[PDB]
Short mmCIF file of N, CA and C in Angstrom, two decimals:
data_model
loop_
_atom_site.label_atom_id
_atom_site.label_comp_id
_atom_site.label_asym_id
_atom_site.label_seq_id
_atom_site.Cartn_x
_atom_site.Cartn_y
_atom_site.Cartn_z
N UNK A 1 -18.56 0.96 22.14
CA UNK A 1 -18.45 1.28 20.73
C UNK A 1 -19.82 1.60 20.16
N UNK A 2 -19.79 2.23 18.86
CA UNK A 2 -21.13 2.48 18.08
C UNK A 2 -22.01 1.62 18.26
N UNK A 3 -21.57 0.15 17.75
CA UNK A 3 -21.99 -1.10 18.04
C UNK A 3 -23.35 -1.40 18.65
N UNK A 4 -23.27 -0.97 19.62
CA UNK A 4 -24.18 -1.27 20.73
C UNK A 4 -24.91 0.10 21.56
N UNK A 5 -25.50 -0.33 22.75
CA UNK A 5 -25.68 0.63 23.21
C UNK A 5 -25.90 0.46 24.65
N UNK A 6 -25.60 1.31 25.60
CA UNK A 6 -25.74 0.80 27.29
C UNK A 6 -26.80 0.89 27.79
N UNK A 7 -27.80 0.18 28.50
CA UNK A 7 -29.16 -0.44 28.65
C UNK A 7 -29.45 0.67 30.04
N UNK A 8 -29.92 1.77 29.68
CA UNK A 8 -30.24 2.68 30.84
C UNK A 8 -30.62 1.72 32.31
N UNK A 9 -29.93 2.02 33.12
CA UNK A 9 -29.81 1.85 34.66
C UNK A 9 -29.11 0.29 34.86
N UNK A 10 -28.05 -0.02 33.97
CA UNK A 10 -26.99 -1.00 34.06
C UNK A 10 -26.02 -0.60 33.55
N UNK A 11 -24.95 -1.08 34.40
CA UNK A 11 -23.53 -0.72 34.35
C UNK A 11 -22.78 -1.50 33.28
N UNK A 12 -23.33 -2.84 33.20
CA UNK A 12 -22.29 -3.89 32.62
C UNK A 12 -23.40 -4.33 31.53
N UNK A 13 -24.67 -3.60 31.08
CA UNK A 13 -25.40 -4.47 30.00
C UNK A 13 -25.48 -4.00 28.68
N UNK A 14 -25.58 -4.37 27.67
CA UNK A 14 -25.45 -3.60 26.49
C UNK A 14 -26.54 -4.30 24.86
N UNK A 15 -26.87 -3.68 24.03
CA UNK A 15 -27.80 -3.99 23.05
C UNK A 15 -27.11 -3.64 21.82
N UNK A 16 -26.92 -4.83 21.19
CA UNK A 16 -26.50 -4.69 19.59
C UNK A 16 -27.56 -4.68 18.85
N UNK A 17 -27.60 -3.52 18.09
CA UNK A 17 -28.91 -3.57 17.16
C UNK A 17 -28.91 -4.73 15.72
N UNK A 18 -27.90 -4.43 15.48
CA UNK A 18 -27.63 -5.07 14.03
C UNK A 18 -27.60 -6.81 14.03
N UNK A 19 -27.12 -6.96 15.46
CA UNK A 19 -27.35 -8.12 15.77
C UNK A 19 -28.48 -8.61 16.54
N UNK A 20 -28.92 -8.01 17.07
CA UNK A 20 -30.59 -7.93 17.76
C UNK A 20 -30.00 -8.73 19.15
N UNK A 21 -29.01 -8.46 19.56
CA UNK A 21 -28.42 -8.83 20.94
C UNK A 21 -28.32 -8.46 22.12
N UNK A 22 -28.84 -9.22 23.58
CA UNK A 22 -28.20 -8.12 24.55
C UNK A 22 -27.56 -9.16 25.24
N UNK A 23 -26.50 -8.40 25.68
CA UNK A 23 -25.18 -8.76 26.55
C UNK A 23 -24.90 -8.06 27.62
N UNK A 24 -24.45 -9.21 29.25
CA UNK A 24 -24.44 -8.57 30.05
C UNK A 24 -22.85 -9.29 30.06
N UNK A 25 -21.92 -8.04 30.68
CA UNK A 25 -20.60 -8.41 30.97
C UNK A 25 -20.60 -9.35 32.42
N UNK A 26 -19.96 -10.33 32.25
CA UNK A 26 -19.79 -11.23 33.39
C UNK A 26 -19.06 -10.84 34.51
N UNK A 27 -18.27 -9.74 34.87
CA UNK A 27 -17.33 -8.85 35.78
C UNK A 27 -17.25 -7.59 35.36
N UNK A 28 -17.09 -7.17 33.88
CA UNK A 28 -16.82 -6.47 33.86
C UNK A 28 -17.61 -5.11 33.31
N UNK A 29 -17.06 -3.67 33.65
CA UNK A 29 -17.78 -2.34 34.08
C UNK A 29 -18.21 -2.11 32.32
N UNK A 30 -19.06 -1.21 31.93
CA UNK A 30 -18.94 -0.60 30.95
C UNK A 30 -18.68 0.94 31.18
N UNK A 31 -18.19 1.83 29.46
CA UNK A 31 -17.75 2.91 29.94
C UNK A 31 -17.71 3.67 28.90
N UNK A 32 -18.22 4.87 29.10
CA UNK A 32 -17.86 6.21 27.83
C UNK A 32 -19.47 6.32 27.20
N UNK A 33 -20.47 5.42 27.50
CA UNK A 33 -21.68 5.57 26.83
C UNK A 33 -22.05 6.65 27.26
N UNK A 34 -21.86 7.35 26.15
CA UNK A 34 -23.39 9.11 26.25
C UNK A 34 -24.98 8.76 26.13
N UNK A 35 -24.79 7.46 25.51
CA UNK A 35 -26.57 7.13 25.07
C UNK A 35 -26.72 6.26 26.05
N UNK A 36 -27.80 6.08 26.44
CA UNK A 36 -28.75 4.94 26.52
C UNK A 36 -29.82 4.19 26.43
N UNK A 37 -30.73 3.15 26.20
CA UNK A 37 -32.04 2.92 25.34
C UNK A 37 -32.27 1.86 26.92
N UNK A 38 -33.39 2.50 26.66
CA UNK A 38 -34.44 1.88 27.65
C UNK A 38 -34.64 0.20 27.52
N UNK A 39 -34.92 -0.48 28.26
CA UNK A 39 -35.23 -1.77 27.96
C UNK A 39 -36.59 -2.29 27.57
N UNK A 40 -36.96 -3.35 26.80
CA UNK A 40 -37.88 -3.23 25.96
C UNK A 40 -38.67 -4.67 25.50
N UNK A 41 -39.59 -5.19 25.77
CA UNK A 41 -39.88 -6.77 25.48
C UNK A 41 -39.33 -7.12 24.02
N UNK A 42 -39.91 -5.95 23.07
CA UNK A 42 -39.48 -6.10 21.74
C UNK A 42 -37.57 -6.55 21.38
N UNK A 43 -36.93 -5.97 22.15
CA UNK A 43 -35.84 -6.32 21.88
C UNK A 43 -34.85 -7.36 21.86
N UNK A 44 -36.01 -8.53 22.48
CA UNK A 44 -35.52 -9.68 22.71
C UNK A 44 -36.47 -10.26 21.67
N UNK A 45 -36.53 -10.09 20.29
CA UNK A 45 -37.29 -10.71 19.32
C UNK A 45 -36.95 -12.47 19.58
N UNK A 46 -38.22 -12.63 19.74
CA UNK A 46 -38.51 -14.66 19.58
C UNK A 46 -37.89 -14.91 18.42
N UNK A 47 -36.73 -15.77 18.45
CA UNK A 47 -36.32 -16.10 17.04
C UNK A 47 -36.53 -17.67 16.57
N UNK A 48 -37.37 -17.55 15.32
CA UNK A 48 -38.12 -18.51 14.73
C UNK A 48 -37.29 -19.89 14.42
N UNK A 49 -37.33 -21.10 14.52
CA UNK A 49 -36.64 -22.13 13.45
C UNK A 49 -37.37 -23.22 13.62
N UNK A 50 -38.05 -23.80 12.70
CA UNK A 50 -38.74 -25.43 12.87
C UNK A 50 -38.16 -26.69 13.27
N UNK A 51 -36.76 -26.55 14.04
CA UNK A 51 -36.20 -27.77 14.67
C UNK A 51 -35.51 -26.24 15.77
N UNK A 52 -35.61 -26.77 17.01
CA UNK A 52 -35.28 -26.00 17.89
C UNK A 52 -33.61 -25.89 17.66
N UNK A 53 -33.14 -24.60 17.77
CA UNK A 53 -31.58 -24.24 17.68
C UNK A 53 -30.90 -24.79 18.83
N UNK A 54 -29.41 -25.64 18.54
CA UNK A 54 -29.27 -26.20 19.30
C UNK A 54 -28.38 -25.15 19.74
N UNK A 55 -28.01 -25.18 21.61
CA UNK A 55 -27.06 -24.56 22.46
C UNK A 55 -26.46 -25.50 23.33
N UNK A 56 -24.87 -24.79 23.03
CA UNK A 56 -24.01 -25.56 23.47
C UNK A 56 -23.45 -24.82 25.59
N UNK A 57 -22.38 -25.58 26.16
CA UNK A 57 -22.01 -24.39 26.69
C UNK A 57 -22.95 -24.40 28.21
N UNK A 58 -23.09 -23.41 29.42
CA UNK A 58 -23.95 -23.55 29.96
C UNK A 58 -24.94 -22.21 29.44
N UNK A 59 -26.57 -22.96 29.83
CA UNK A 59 -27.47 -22.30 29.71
C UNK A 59 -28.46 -22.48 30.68
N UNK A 60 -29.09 -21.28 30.81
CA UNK A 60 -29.72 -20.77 32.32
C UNK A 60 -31.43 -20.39 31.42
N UNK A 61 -32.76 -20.95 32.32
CA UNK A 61 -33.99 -20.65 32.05
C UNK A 61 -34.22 -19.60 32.51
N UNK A 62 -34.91 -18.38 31.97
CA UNK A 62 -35.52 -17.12 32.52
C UNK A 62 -36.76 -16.99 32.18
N UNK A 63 -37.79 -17.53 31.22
CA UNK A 63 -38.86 -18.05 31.28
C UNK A 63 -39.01 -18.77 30.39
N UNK A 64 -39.36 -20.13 30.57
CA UNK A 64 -39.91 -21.05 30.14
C UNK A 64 -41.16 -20.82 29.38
N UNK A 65 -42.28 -20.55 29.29
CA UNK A 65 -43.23 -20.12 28.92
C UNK A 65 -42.65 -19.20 27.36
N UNK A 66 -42.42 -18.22 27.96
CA UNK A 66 -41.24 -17.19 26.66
C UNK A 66 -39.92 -17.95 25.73
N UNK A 67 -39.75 -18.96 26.26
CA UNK A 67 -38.54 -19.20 25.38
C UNK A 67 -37.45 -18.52 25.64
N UNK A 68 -37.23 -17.86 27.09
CA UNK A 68 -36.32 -16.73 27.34
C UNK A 68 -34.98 -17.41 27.94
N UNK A 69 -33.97 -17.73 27.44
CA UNK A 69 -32.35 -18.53 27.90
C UNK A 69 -31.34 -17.38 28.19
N UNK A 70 -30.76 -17.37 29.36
CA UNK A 70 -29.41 -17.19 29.69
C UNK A 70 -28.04 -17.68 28.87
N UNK A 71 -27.32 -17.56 27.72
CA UNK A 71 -26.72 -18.46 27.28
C UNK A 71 -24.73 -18.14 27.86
N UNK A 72 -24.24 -18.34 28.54
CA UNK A 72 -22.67 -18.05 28.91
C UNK A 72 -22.07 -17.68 27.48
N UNK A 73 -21.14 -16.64 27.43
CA UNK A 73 -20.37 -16.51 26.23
C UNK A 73 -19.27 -15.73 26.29
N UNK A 74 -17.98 -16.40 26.01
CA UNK A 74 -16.93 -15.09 25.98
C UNK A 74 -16.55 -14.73 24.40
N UNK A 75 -16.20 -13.42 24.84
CA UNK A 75 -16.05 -12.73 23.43
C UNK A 75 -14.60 -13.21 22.92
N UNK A 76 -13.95 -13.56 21.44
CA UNK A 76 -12.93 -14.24 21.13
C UNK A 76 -11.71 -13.46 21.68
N UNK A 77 -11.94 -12.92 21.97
CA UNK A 77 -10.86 -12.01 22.64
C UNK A 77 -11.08 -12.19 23.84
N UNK A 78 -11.94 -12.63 24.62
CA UNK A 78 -11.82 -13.69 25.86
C UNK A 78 -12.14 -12.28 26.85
N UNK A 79 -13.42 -12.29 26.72
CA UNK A 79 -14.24 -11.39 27.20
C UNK A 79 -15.82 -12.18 27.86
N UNK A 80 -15.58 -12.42 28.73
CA UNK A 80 -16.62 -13.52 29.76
C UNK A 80 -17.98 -12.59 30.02
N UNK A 81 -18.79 -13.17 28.95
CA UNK A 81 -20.36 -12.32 29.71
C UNK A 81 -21.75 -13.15 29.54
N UNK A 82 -22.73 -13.30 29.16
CA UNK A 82 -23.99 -13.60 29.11
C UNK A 82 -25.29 -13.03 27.90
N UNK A 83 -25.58 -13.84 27.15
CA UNK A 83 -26.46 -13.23 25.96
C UNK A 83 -27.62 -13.78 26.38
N UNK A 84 -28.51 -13.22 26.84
CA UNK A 84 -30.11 -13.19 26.97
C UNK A 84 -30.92 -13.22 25.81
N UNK A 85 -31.36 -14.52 24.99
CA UNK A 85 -31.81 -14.94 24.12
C UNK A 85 -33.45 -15.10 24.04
N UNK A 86 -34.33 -15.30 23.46
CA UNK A 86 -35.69 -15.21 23.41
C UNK A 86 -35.94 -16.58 21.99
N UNK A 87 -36.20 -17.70 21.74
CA UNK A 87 -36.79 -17.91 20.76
C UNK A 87 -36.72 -19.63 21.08
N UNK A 88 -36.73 -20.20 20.02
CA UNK A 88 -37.20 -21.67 19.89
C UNK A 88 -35.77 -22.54 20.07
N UNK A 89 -35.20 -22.46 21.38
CA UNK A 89 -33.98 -22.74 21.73
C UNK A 89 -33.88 -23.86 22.44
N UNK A 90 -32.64 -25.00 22.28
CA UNK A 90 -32.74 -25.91 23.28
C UNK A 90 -31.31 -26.44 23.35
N UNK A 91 -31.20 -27.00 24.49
CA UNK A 91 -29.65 -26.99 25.43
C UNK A 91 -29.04 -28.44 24.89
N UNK A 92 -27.56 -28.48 24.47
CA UNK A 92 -27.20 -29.68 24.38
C UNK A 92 -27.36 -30.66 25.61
N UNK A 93 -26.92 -29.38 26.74
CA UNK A 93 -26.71 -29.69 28.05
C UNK A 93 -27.68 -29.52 29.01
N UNK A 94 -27.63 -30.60 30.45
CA UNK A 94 -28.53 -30.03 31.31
C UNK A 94 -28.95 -28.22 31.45
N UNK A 95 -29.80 -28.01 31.69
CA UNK A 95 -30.26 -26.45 32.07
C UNK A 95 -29.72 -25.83 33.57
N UNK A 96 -29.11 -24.63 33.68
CA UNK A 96 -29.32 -24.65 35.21
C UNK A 96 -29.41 -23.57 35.58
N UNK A 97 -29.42 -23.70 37.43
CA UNK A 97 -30.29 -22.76 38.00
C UNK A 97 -29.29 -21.14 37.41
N UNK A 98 -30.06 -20.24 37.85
CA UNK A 98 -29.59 -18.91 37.37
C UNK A 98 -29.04 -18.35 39.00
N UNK A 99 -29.41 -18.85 40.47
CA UNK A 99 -28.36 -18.68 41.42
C UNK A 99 -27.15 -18.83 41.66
N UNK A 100 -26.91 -20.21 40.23
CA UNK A 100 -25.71 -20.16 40.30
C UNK A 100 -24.57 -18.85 39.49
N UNK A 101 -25.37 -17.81 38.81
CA UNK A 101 -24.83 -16.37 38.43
C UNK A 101 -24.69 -15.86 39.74
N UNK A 102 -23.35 -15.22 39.09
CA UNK A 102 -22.72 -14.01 40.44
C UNK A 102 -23.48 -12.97 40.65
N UNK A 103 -23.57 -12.04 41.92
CA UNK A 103 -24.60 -10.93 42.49
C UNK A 103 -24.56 -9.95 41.42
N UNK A 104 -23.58 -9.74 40.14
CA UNK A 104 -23.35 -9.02 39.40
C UNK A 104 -24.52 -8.93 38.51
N UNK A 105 -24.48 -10.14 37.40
CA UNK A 105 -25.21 -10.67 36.69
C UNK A 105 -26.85 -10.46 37.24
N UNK A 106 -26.76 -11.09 38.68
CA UNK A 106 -28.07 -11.41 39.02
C UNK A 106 -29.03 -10.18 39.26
N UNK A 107 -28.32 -9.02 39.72
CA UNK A 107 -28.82 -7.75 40.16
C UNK A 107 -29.20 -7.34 38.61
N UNK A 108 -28.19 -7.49 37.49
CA UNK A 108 -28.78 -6.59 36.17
C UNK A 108 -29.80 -6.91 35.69
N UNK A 109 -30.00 -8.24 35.31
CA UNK A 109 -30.90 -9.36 35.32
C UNK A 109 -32.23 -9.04 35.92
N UNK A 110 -32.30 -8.63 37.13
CA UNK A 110 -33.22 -8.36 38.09
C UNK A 110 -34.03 -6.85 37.20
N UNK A 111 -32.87 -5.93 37.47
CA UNK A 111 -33.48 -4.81 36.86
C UNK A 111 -33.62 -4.81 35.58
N UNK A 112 -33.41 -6.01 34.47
CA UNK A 112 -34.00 -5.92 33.45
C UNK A 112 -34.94 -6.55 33.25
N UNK A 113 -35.69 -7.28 34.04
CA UNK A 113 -36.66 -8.40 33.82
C UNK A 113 -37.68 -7.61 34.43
N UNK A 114 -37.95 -7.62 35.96
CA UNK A 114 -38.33 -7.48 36.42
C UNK A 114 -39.61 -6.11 36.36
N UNK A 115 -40.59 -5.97 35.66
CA UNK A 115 -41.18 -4.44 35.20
C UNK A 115 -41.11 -3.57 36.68
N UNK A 116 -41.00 -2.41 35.81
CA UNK A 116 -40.73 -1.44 37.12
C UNK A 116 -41.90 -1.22 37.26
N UNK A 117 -43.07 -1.71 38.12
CA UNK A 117 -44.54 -1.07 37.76
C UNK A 117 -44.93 -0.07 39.26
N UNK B 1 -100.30 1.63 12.51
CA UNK B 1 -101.30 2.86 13.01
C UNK B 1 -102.15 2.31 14.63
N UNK B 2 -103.48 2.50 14.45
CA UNK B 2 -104.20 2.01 15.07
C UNK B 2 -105.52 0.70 15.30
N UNK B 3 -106.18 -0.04 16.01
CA UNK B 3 -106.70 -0.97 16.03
C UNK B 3 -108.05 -0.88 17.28
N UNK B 4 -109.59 -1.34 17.17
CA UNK B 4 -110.12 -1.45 18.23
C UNK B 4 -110.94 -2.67 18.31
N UNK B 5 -111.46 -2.66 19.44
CA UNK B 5 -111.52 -4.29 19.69
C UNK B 5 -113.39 -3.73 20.45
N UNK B 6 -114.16 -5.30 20.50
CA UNK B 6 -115.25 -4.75 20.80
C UNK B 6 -115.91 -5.88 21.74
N UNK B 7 -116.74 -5.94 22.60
CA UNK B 7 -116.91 -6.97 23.95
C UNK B 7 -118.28 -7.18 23.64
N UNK B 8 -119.06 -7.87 23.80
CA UNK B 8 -120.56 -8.28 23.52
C UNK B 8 -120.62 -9.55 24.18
N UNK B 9 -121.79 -8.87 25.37
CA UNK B 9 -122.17 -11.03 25.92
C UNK B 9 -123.49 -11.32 24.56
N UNK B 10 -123.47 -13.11 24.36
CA UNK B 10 -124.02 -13.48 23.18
C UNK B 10 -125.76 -13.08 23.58
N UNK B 11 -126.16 -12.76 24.22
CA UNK B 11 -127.09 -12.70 24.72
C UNK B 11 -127.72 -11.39 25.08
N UNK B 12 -127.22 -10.57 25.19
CA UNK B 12 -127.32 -9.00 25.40
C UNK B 12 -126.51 -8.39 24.19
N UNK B 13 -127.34 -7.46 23.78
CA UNK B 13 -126.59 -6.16 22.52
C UNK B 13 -125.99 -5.08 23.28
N UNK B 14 -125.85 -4.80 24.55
CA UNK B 14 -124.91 -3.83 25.77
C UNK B 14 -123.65 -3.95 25.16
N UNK B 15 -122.52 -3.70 24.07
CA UNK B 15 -121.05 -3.77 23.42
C UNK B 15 -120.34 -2.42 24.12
N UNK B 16 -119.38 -3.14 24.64
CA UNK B 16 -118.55 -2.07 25.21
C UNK B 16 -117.09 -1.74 24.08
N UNK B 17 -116.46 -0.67 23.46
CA UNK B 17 -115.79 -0.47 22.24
C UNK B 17 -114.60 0.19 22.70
N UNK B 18 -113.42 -0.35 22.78
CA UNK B 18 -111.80 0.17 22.96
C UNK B 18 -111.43 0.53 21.96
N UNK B 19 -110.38 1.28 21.70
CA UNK B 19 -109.27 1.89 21.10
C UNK B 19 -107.97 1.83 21.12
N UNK B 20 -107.38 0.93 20.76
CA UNK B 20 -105.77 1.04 20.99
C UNK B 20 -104.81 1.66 19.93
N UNK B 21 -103.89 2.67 19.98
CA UNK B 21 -102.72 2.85 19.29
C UNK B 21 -101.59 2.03 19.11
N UNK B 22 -101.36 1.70 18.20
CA UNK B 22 -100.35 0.55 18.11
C UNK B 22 -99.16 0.93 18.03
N UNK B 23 -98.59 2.55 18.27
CA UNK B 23 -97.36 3.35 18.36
C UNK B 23 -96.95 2.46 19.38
N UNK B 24 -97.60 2.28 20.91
CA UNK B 24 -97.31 1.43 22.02
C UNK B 24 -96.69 0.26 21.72
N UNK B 25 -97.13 -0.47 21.23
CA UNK B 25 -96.06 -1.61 21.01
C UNK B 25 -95.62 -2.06 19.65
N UNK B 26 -95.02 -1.06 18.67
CA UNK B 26 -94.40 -0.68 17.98
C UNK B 26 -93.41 0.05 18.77
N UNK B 27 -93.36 1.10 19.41
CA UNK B 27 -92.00 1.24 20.87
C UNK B 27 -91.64 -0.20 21.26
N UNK B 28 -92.67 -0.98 22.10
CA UNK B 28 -91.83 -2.15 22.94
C UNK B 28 -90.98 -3.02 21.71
N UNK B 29 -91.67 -3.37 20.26
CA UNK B 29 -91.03 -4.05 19.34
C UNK B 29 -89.73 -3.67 19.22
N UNK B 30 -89.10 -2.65 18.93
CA UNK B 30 -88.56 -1.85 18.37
C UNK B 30 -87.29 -1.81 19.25
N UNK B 31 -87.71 -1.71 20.78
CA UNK B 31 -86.93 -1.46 22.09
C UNK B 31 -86.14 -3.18 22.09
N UNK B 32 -86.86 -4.09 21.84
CA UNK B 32 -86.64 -5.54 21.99
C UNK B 32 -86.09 -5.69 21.38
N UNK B 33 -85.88 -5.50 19.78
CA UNK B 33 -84.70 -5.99 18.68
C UNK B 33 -83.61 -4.77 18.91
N UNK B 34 -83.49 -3.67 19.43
CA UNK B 34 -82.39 -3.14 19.65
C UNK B 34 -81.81 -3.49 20.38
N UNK B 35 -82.43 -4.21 21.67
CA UNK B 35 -81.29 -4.55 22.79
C UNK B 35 -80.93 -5.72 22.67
N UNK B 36 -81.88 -6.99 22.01
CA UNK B 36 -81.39 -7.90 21.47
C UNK B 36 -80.27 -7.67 20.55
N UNK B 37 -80.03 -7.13 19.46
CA UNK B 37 -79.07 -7.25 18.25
C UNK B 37 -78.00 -6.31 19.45
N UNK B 38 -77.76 -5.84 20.76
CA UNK B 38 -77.09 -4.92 21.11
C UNK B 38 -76.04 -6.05 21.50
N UNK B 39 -77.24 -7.25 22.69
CA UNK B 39 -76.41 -8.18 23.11
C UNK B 39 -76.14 -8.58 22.12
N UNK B 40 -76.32 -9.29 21.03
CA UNK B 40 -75.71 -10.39 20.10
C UNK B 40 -74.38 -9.53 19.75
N UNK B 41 -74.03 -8.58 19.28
CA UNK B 41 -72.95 -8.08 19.01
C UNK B 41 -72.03 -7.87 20.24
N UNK B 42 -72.70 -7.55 21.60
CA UNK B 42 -71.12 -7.31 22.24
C UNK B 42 -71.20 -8.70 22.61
N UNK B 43 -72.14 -9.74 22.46
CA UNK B 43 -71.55 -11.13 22.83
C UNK B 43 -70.27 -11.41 21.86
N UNK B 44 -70.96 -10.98 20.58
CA UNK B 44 -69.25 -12.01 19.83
C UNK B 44 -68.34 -10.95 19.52
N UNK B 45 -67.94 -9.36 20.25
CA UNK B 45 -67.23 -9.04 20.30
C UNK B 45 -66.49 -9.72 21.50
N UNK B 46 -67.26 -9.75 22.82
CA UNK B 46 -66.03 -10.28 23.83
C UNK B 46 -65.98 -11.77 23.57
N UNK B 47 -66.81 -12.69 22.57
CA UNK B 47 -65.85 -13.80 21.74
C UNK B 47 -64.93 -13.76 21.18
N UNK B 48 -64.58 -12.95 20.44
CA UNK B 48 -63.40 -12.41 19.83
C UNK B 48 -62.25 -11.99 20.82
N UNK B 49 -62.92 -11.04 21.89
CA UNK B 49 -62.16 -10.91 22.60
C UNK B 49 -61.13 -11.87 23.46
N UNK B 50 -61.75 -12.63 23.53
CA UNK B 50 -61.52 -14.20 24.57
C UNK B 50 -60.61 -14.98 23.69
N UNK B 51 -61.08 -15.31 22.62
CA UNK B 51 -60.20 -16.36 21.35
C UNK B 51 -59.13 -15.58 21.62
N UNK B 52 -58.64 -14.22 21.80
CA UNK B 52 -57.67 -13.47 21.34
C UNK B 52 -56.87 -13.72 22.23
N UNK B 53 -57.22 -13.45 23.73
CA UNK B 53 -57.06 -13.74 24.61
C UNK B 53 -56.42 -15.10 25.00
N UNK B 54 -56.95 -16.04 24.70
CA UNK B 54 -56.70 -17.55 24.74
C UNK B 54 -55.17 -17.69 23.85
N UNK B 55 -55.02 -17.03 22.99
CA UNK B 55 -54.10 -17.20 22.34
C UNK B 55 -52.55 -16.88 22.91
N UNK B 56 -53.53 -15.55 24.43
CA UNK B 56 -52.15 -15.47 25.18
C UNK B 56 -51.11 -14.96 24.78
N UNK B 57 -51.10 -13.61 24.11
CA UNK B 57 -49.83 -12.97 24.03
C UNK B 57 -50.28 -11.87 24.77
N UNK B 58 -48.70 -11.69 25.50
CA UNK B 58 -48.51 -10.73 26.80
C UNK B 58 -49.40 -9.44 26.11
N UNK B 59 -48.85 -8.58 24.85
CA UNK B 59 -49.00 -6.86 24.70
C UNK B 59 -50.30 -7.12 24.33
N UNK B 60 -50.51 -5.79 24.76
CA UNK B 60 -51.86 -5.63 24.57
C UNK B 60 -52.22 -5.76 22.53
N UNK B 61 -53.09 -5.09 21.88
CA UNK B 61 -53.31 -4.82 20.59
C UNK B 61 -52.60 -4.03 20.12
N UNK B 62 -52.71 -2.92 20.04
CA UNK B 62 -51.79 -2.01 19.60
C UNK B 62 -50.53 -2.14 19.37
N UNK B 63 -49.89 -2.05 20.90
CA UNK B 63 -48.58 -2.96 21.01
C UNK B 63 -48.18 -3.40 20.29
N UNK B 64 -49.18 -4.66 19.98
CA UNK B 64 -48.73 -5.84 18.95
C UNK B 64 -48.70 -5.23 17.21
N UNK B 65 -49.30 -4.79 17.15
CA UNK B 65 -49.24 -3.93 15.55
C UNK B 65 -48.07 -2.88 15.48
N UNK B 66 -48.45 -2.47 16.52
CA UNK B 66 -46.99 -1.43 16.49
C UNK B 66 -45.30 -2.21 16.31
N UNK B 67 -45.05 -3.37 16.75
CA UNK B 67 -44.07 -4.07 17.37
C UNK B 67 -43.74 -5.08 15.53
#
């Protein structure tokens, strides 16, 4: 949809502007995007709060240093994917490893983190 | 400008009489506080640089203004 937009060289990842979000589908394909926007440090804006935001749910470290969380989420319509968060965040729950994500996840993940240098 | 200087043993009137231009070290003066005030400034530019640094954010400057 308008909504968002598909994260050039991922199949299943996507960026809400309005919401300053990116989402990777947990199985499933994306489809029909004519656009796509490059990936970008900026787009994972650090989001500010003077008592760390609490997260419920499981959540996965991608850098510690950054404040960067994996957080699990299905859409209410029961749509299973992953929001890659950036800011002053902390887990109700233990933290865990990110091997435990499927080769799906882990490959997009890869090519979005990872600088292409 | 200029300055001369003059040698006499106390005992003999034989005075031998120099000449110096003082352009000569009016250059070396001159050469010394430029490269001095050259270092003092890029010292506390790469102080600045370093504090900035220390502070440890990934983008470079620009970046960061731009962003």
């Amino acid at each position: 949809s308008k909504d968002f937009l598909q994260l050039k060289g991922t199949m299943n990842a996507f960026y809400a502007p309005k919401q300053r979000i990116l989402s990777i589908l947990a199985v499933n394909r994306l489809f029909g995007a004519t656009e796509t926007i490059d990936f970008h440090p900026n787009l994972l804006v650090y989001r500010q709060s003077s008592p760390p935001v609490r997260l419920t749910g499981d959540v996965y470290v991608v850098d510690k240093n950054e404040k960067v969380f994996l957080v699990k989420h299905v859409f209410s319509n029961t749509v299973p994917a992953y929001l890659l968060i950036r800011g002053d965040y902390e887990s109700s729950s233990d933290l865990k490893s990110l091997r435990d994500l499927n080769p799906w996840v882990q490959n997009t993940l890869l090519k979005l983190l990872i600088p292409d240098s | 400008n200029k300055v001369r200087t003059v040698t006499e043993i106390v005992n003999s009137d034989e005075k031998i009489q120099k000449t110096y231009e003082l352009a000569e070290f009016d250059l070396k003066n001159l050469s010394s506080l430029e490269s001095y005030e050259t270092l003092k400034i890029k010292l506390a530019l790469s102080k600045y640089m370093a504090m900035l640094s220390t502070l440890e954010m990934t983008q470079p400057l620009l970046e960061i203004f731009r962003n």
